[PDB]
Write a protein that binds this ligand. Structure first.
Ligand SMILES: Nc1ncnc2c1ncn2[C@@H]1O[C@H](COP(=O)(O)OP(=O)(O)O)[C@@H](O)[C@H]1O
Ligand SMILES: Nc1ncnc2c1ncn2[C@@H]1O[C@H](COP(=O)(O)OP(=O)(O)O)[C@@H](O)[C@H]1O
Lengths: 116, 116
């Protein structure tokens, strides 16, 4: 799939066709929708530029256009060879979402008093 | 002049017609150019939205269009009555620049040892 975090960016419209059952499901869908922009924003931020503007310009462009952080310009990722294994992307997303969702369901935390 | 910080945003193109004498003058001009976006970003950030995208959309729009943070949409500033006294804007910019530029020319700081 496209590299640079654009694979997850192109999946944002797929979340607008969902119908949440209740308000909490809508909250969760919005959480995932906001999260989908994080990899591209982080890659742009590490390059010394503003991640928000880069992500906005990526989303306003055509489906084959993304951002080359190394060169620092908007290019065709398949043509330039910035591609990612789809297995890696889906595995990372699934694991991150699964663990963090369960973490965010906590109300009480029990730890051990630091004897040593 | 236009309110919401758009008056300073519209002065960014006026800084592209300058020819710096040397590299340090270019650095100072770039500092002012980056600073000119700050009021609009701060107003947008206090409104709970992303300031960078708001400022980018303001700059890509026509000269009479700005952002209504109270309503939360892009409107005509003069028509909606979001206007600022030009004296206030120029005074704020002049004082801030004058003091901060002198502050940024320091290499040594001498203070009193805290006896009490
Ligand atoms: N030249 C480039 N331009 C834009 N994005 C890139 C470029 N090279 C790699 N990337 C992106 O950076 C990510 C790789 O970062 P990396 O440090 O390997 O993180 P991870 O260990 O999570 O894969 C990939 O998702 C890839 O899409
Ligand atoms: N409805 C609005 N939409 C957008 N910007 C506004 C609105 N109302 C006021 N502003 C902007 O907010 C600024 C006023 O902020 P304020 O708290 O008075 O700061 P200051 O004391 O420095 O003037 C003005 O520059 C004005 O342009």
């Amino acid at each position: 799939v496209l590299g640079g975090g654009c694979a997850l960016l192109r999946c944002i419209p797929a979340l607008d066709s969902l119908t949440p059952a209740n308000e909490d499901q809508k909250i969760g869908i919005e959480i995932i929708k906001r999260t989908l922009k994080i990899p591209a924003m982080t890659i742009a931020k590490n390059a010394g530029v503003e991640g928000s503007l880069i992500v906005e310009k990526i989303m306003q462009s055509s489906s084959e256009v993304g951002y080359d952080a190394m060169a620092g310009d908007f290019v065709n990722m398949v043509e330039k060879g910035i591609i990612d294994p789809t297995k890696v992307v889906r595995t990372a997303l699934l694991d991150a979402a699964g663990v963090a969702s369960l973490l965010t369901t906590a109300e009480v935390v029990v730890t051990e008093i630091p004897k040593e």
